[PDB]
Amino acid sequence: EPSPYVEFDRRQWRALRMSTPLALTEEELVGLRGLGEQIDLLEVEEVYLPLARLIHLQVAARQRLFAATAEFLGEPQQNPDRPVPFIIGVAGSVAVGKSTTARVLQALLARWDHHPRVDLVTTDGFLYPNAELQRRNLMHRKGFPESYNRRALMRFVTSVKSGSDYACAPVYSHLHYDIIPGAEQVVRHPDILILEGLNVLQTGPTLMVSDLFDFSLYVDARIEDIEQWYVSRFLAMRTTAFADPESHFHHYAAFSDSQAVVAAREIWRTINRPNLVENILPTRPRATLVLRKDADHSINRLRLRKL
Amino acid sequence: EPSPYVEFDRRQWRALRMSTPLALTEEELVGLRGLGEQIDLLEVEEVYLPLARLIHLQVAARQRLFAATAEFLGEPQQNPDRPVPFIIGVAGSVAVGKSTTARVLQALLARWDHHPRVDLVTTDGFLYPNAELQRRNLMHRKGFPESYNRRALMRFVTSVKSGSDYACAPVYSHLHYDIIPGAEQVVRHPDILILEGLNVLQTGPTLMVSDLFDFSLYVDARIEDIEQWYVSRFLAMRTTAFADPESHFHHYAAFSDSQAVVAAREIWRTINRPNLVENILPTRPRATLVLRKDADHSINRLRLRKL
Ligand SMILES: Nc1nc2c(ncn2[C@@H]2O[C@H](COP(=O)(O)OP(=O)(O)CP(=O)(O)O)[C@@H](O)[C@H]2O)c(=O)[nH]1
Ligand SMILES: Nc1nc2c(ncn2[C@@H]2O[C@H](COP(=O)(O)OP(=O)(O)CP(=O)(O)O)[C@@H](O)[C@H]2O)c(=O)[nH]1
Ligand SMILES: CC(C)(CO)[C@@H](O)C(=O)NCCC(=O)O
Ligand SMILES: CC(C)(CO)[C@@H](O)C(=O)NCCC(=O)O
């Protein structure tokens, strides 16, 4: 059976590093690593460095493609100080590590030789505000496709990829659990834009951000593991994020281990798990690279799209 | 508002021919032209020749892409007598002209300088046989996604694009209105494969043939026009195809104009129109090039994806 995909173990994948230099310190890694994440410099070298080599091979190759369409159209030569931005999507469940994966990726690419402008945007900022979610009866479906302003999202990425000087995204506050009035993240003709969220790989009856991705990753793990990671993070957060009296979820800080486990499981069951099974997982087949994690968070398997 | 798309009129589009030679005679065109189609050598020159220039620019460019992934993987050099097959999808309603568009495209590309092997496959052969459609209660939904063996279809195109020496498709008989026992269409590592059908541009919870297309066309027209074309073709066929006593639809040959119009409208209303509105039209946003036809079948407008 021929296949669009090729499967690697960590042994096979890490050979593909060739001579890519490691440009990240252990301390720098910490600044990027999320609560509960196990990524170390060795995963960076054995997993993220071949990745970064793949990507940089494909950035130049993907530029030929837009150049052919320019040539056809009898369009001028593209300013080499403004190529067409390479767009990278990163997807997966809540709690699977995908935001760290994306932050690490950004760090690695920014440190490539010619110092590319590499911006990172999460879909959080494109959530409808709570007052608007409440209007729509969606206050308990944050993360589902319909809880996002997908039109604004598509506009944002279309703007950036189509060469705009600047494009703006709104900004979400996890502390306050809402969009921040007046806050903008401004992206200015970067060379690479990484877009990370749950359903960014979705497809449908209109052109969507996934149709603009030049490359995508999906961070995968067994569902039962993800839940464990999610519950455990929730318990840990009683003394980090929920401890802040300003935090929308401050009431959780004083939950017993057992009360906390019960609350987190209920949130997993009613929100995150269904969103995962119904919307996120069905996008996995399309990702250029699936990063498969074991129960201990360690990436030991990879699936690349060769077609 | 920035846009993934650029819109042309025939004036703007035909300028993009540059010096592409016309290699098709009027007689050759006839061999390709479907009952009721108005395509002439002038549409070929003003519409299909820029198209063919776009495509050939993108074939070489799209090869860089697969080469980068080979390089990354430390794969050998690709035999230049066997590149990775460029896959082209052609979609649209029944009766809109898309099969002629595809046959013409094949003729034009086969006549490019180095004489590329250019195969053409329609999704007809991947319809479930009638006995199997009946089992599924689908004898009146031929053309809807579920009336096709989509797994076999995906396998076929995956086989070809992944470099197989040969791949086989079953063969449908319009005369008999069923799959022909024992018949195979054999495709042998072509340089380009054109795949044409109603829903070939569809997307979903699994990797599908649209995810393998390097380029796609959608042949568009106003729904009311398509219906007129469909009814008129049905009336014309009383003296061509339905006239054959072997034809599954021979009974239609003896319909009055008015009986025929009533039968065709009913088939349009209950089968083709719903399939168009529900399944085919929602794929239009993704096509690389939409060919928009006026009431007289003439292509006067085009929409290209630049992103
Ligand atoms: N305080 C806070 N920050 C969050 C939360 N969710 C995501 N973040 C932001 O994203 C980072 C998480 O890194 P990582 O563990 O890779 O995130 P993830 O696996 O995508 C977890 P989730 O998808 O649940 O956010 C956090 O360090 C923080 O910057 C949250 O619930 N609370
Ligand atoms: N005899 C016959 N041939 C058909 C039929 N439908 C498609 N074909 C094949 O496809 C060709 C049609 O050319 P074209 O007019 O572009 O097809 P189309 O617009 O896709 C029409 P449809 O989609 O309804 O087949 C025919 O000449 C024939 O080879 C049909 O109902 N009867
Ligand atoms: C469970 C964690 C810590 C992991 O992301 C986080 O999703 C969380 O608990 N956030 C606040 C609770 C909530 O998700 O509503
Ligand atoms: C209406 C035409 C002639 C146009 O394709 C053709 O679709 C047709 O009439 N075929 C046989 C009738 C049927 O579609 O069942």
Q: Using DSSP bridges, classify how beta strands A167-169 and A215-221 pair: parallel, antiparallel or unpaired.
A: unpaired
Q: How far is the centre of ligand 4, averaged over its atoms, from the C-alpha of B234 (Å)? A: 5
Cα–Cα distance between A113 and A92 in angstroms, integer?
30
A177 φψ region: left (φ > 0), alpha (ψ -120 to 50), beta (else) = left
Atom of ligand 4 nearest to the CA of B237: 3
A93 annotated to bind ligand: yes
Cross-chain Cβ contact B207/A4 below 8 Å: yes
Which residues partner with B7 through β-bridges? Answer: B303
Terminal CA-to-CA distance of chain A, rounded, Å?
14
Hey, which bits of chain B come out as E strands? 5-9, 86-91, 118-122, 167-169, 172-173, 178-179, 185-187, 192-197, 215-221, 289-293, 299-305
With a 6 Å cutoff on the Cβ, whether A49 touches ligand 1 is no
Q: What is the CA angle B149-B151-B154, rounded to 5?
A: 110
Cα–Cα distance between B206 and B195 in angstroms, integer?
19
| List of chain B residues whose C-beta atoms are within 8 Å of the C-beta of residue A71 | 57
The closest of B207, B75, B158, B61 to A54, measured between CA atoms, is B75
Elucidated via: X-ray
For chain B, positions 92-121, list CB contacts with chain A under 8 A: none
A306's tokens:
């060769």
For residue B164, give the CATH number of its domain.
3.40.50.300
B172's tokens:
């449908």
**A186, A65 contact by CB (below 8 A):** no
3-state secondary structure of B67: helix
Question: Which residues 6+ apart lie within 8 Å of A234 measured at CB?
Answer: A252, A260, A263, A264, A267
By residue range, what is the domain housing residue A60?
1-307
The closest of B103, B217, B108, B196 to B153, measured between CA atoms, is B196
Atom of ligand 3 nearest to the CA of A233: 3
Q: Which of B35, B230, B242, B276 to mutate to test the pocket of ligand 4 (most atoms within 8 A of CB)?
A: B230
The closest of A75, A88, A154, A155 to A116, measured between CA atoms, is A88
A97 annotated to bind ligand: yes
Q: What is the CA angle A203-B195-B234, rounded to 5?
A: 100
Question: Cα-Cα-Cα-Cα dihedral of B25, B12, B90, B260, to 10°?
Answer: -80
Resolution limit in angstroms? 2.3
**Ligand 2 atom 27: the closest Cα is on which residue?**
B34
Q: Is B57 on the interface with A (CB under 8 A)?
A: yes
Q: Is A203 on the interface with B (CB under 8 A)?
A: yes
**A191, A109 contact by CB (below 8 A):** no
As annotated, the binding site of B for ATP includes 92-99
Give the single-character DSSP code of B145.
G
Q: Is B204 on the interface with A (CB under 8 A)?
A: yes
- Rg of chain B taking only CA atoms, in angstroms: 20
Written in H, E and C, the secondary structure of A201-258 is: CCCCCCCCHHHHCCEEEEEEECHHHHHHHHHHHHHHHCCCHHHCCCCCCHHHHHCCHH
The closest of A219, A221, A212 to A192, measured between CA atoms, is A212
- The total domain count for chain A is 1
Angle between helices A98-110 and A49-72 (to 10 degrees): 70
Cα dist from B48 to B229, B247, B300, whole Å: 22, 34, 12
Which residues partner with A216 through β-bridges? Answer: A89
